[PDB]
JSON list of C-alpha atoms in Angstrom, two decimals:
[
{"chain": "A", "resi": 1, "resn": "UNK", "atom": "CA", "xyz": [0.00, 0.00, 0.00]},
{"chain": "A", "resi": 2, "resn": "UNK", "atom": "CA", "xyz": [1.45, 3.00, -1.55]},
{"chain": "A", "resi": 3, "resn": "UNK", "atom": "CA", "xyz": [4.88, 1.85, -2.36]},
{"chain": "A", "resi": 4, "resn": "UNK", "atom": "CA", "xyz": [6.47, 5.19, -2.34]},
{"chain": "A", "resi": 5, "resn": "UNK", "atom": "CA", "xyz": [5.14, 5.81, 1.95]},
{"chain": "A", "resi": 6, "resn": "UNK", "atom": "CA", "xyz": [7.54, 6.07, 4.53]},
{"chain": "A", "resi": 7, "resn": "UNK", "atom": "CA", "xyz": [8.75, 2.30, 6.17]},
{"chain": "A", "resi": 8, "resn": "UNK", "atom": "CA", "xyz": [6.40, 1.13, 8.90]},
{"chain": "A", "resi": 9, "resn": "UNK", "atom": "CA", "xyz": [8.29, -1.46, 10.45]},
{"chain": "A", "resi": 10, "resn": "UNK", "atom": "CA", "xyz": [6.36, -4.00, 12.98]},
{"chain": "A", "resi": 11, "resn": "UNK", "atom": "CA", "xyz": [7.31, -6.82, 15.14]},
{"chain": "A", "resi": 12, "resn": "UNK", "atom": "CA", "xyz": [4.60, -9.59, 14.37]},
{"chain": "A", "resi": 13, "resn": "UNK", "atom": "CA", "xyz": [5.12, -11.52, 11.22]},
{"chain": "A", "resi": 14, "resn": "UNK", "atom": "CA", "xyz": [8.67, -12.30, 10.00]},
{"chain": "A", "resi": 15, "resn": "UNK", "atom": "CA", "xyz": [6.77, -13.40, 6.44]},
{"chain": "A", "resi": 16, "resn": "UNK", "atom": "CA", "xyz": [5.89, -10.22, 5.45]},
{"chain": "A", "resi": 17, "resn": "UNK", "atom": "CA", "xyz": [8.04, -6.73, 4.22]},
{"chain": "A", "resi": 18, "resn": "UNK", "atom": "CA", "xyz": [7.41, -4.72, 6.99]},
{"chain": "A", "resi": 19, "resn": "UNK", "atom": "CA", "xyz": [8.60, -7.00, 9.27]},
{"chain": "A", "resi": 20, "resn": "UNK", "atom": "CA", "xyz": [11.55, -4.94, 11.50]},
{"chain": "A", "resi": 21, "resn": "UNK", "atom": "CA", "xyz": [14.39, -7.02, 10.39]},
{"chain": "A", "resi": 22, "resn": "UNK", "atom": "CA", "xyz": [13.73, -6.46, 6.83]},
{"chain": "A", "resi": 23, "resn": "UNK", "atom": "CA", "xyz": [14.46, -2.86, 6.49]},
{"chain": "A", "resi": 24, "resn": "UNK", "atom": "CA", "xyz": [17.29, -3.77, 4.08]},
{"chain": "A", "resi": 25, "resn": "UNK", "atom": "CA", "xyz": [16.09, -7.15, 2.33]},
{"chain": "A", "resi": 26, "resn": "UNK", "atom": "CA", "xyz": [16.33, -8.03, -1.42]},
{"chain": "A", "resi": 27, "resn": "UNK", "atom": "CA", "xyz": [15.06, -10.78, -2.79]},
{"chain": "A", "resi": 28, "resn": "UNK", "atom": "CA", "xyz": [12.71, -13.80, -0.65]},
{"chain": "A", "resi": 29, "resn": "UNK", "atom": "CA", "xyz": [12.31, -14.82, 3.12]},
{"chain": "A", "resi": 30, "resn": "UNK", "atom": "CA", "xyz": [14.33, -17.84, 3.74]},
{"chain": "A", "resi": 31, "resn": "UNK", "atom": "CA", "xyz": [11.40, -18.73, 6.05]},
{"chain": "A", "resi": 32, "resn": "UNK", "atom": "CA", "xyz": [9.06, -19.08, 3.62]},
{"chain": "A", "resi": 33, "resn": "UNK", "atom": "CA", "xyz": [11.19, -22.21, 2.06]},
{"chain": "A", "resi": 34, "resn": "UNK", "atom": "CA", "xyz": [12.37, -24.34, 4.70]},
{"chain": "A", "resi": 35, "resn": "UNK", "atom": "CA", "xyz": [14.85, -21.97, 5.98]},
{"chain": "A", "resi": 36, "resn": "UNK", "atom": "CA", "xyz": [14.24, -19.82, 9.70]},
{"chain": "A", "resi": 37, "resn": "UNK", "atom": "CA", "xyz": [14.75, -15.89, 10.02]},
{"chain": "A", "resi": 38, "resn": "UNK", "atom": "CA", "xyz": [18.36, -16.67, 10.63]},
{"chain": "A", "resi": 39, "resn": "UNK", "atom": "CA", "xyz": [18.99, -20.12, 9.33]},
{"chain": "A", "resi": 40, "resn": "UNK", "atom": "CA", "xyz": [19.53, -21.44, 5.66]},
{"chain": "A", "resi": 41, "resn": "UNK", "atom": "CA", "xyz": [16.55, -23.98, 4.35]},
{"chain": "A", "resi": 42, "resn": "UNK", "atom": "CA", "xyz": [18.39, -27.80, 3.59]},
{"chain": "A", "resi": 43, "resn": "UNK", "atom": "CA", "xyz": [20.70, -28.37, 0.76]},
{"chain": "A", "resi": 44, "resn": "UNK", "atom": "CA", "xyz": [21.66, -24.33, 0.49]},
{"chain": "A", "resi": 45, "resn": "UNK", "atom": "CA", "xyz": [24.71, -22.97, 1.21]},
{"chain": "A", "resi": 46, "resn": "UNK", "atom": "CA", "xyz": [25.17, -20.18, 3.91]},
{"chain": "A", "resi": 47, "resn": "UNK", "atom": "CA", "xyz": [27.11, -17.22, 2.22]},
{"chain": "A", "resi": 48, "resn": "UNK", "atom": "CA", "xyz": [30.28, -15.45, 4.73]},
{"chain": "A", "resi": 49, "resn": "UNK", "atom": "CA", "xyz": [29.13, -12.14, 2.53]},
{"chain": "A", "resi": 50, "resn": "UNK", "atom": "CA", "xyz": [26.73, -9.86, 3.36]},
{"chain": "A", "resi": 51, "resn": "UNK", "atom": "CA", "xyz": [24.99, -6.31, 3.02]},
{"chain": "A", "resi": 52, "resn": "UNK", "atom": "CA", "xyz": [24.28, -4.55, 5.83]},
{"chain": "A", "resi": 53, "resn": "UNK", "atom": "CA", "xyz": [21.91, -2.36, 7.75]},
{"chain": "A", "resi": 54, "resn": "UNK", "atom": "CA", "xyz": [20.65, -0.90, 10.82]},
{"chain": "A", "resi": 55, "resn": "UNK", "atom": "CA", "xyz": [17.20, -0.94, 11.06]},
{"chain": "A", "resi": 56, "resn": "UNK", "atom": "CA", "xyz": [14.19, 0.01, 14.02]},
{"chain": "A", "resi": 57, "resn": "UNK", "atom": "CA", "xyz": [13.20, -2.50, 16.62]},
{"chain": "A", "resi": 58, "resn": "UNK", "atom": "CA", "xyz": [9.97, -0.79, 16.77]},
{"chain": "A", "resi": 59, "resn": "UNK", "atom": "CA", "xyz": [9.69, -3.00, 20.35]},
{"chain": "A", "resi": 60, "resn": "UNK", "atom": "CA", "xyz": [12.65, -2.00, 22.13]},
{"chain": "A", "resi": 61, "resn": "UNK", "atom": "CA", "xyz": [12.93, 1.28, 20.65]},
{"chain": "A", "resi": 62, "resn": "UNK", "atom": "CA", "xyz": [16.23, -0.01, 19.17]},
{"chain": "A", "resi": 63, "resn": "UNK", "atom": "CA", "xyz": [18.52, -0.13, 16.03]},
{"chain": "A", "resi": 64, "resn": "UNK", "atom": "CA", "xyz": [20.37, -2.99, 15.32]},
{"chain": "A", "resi": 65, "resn": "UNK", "atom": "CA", "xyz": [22.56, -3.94, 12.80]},
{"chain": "A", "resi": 66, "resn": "UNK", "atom": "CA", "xyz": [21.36, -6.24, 10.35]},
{"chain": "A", "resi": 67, "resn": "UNK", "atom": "CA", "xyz": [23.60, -9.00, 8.23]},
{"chain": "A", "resi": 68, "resn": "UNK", "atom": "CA", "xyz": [21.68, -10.05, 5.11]},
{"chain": "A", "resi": 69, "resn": "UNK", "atom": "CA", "xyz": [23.75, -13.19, 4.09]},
{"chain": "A", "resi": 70, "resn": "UNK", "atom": "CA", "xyz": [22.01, -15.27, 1.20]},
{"chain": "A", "resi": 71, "resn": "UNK", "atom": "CA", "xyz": [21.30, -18.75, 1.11]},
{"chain": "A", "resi": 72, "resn": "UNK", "atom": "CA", "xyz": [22.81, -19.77, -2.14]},
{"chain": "A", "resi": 73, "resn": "UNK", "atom": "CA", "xyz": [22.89, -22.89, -4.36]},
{"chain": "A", "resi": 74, "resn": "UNK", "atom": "CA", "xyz": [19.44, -22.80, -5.65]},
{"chain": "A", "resi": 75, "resn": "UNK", "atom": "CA", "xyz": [17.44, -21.33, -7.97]},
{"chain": "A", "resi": 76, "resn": "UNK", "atom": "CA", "xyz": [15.35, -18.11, -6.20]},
{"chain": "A", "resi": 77, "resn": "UNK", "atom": "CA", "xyz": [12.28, -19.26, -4.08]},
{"chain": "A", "resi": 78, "resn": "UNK", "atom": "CA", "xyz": [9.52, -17.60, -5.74]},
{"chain": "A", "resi": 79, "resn": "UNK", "atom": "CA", "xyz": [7.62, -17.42, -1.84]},
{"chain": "A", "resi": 80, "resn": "UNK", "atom": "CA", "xyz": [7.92, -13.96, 0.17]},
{"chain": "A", "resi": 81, "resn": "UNK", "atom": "CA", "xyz": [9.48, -11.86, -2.22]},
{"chain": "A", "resi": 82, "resn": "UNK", "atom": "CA", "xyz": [10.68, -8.27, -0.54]},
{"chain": "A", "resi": 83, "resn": "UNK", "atom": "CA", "xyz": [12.46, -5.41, -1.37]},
{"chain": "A", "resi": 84, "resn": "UNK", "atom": "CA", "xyz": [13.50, -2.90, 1.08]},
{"chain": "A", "resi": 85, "resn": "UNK", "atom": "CA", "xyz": [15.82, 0.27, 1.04]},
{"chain": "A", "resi": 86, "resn": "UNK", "atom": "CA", "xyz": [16.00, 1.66, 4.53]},
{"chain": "A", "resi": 87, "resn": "UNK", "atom": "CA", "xyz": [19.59, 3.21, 3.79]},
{"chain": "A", "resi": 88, "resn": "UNK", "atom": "CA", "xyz": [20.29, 1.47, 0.97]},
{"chain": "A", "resi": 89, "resn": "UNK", "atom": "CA", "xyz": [23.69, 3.37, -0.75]},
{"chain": "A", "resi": 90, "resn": "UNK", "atom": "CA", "xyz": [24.77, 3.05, -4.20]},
{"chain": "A", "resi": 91, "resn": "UNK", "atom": "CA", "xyz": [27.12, -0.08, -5.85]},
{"chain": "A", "resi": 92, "resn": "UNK", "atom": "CA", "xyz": [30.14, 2.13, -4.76]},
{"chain": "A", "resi": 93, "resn": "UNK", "atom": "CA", "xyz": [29.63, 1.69, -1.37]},
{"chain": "A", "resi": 94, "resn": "UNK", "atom": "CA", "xyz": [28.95, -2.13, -1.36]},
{"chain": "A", "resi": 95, "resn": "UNK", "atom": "CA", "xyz": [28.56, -2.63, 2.42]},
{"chain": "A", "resi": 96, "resn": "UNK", "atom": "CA", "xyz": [25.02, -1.02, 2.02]},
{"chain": "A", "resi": 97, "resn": "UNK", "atom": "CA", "xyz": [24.23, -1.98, -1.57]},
{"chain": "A", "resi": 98, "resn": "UNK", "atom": "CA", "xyz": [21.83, -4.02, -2.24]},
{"chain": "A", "resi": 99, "resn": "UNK", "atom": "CA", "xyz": [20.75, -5.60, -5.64]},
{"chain": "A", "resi": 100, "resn": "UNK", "atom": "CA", "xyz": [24.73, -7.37, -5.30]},
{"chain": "A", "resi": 101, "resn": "UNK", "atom": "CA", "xyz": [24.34, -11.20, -5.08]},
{"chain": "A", "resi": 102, "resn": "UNK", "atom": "CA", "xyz": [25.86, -11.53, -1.03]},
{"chain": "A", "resi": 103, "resn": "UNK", "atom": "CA", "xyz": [26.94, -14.95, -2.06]},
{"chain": "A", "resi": 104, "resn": "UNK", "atom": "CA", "xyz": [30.44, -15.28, -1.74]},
{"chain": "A", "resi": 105, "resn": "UNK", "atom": "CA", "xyz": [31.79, -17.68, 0.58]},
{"chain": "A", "resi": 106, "resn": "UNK", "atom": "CA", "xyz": [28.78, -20.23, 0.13]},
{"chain": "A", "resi": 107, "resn": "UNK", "atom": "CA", "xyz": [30.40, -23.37, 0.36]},
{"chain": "A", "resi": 108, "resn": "UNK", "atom": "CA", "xyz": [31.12, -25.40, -3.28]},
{"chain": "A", "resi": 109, "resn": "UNK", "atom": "CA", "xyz": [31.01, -22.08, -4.42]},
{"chain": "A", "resi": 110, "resn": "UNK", "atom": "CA", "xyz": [27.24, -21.99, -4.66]},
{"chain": "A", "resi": 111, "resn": "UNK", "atom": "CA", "xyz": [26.90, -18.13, -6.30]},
{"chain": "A", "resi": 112, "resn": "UNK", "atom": "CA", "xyz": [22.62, -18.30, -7.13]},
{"chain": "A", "resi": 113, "resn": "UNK", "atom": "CA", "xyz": [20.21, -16.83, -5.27]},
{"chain": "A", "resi": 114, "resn": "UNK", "atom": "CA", "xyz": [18.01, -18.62, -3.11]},
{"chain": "A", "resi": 115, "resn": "UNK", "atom": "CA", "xyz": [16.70, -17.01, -0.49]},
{"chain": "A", "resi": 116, "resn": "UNK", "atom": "CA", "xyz": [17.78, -14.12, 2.49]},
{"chain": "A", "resi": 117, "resn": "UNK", "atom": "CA", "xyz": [18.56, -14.49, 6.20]},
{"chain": "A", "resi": 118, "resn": "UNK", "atom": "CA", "xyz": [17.79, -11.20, 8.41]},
{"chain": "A", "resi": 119, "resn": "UNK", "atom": "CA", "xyz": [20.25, -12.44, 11.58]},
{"chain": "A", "resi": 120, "resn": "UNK", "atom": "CA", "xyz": [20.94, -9.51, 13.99]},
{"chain": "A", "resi": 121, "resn": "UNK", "atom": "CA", "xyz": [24.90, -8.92, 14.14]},
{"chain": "A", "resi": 122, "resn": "UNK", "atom": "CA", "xyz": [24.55, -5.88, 17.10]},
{"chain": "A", "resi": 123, "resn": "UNK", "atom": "CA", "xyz": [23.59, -3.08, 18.33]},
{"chain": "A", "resi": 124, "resn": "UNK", "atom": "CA", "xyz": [22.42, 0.50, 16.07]}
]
């Protein structure tokens, strides 16, 4: 609803876009294909890579810094499909961008996108 209105984050429903943790996703919920909030789904590959950002714990009050690592090795999901730019900064400052495939480091050198994690790393 209205795609262009400010980010709304809640703190119900890790499924859906405007869940918290999210703030920065690209791409599918890994918990909408076997995977958890924070864990890869079987067979994937957990990337070391990731983008980062700090989004609004609309609970506590509090930012924390969010490590979107991919789970790669698989064709994309197709189920909870999000895209979120709280922050987001341009390909030349990587760290923050994006629409980059986070995939490096999967083991056997799985480099296709499955599906996104939303793990906390800290604190704002």
């Amino acid at each position: 609803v209205d795609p262009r209105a400010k980010w709304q984050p809640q703190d119900n429903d890790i499924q859906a876009c405007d869940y918290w943790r999210h703030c920065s996703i690209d791409g599918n919920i890994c918990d909408c294909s076997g995977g958890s909030l924070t864990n890869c789904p079987p067979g994937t590959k957990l990337a070391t890579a990731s983008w980062v950002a700090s989004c609004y714990n609309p609970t506590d009050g509090q930012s924390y810094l969010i490590a979107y690592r991919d789970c790669c090795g698989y064709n994309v999901s197709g189920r909870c499909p999000c895209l979120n730019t709280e922050g987001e900064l341009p390909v030349y400052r990587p760290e923050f961008a994006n629409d980059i495939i986070w995939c490096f480091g999967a083991e056997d050198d799985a480099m296709t996108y499955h599906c996104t994690i939303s793990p906390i790393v800290g604190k704002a």
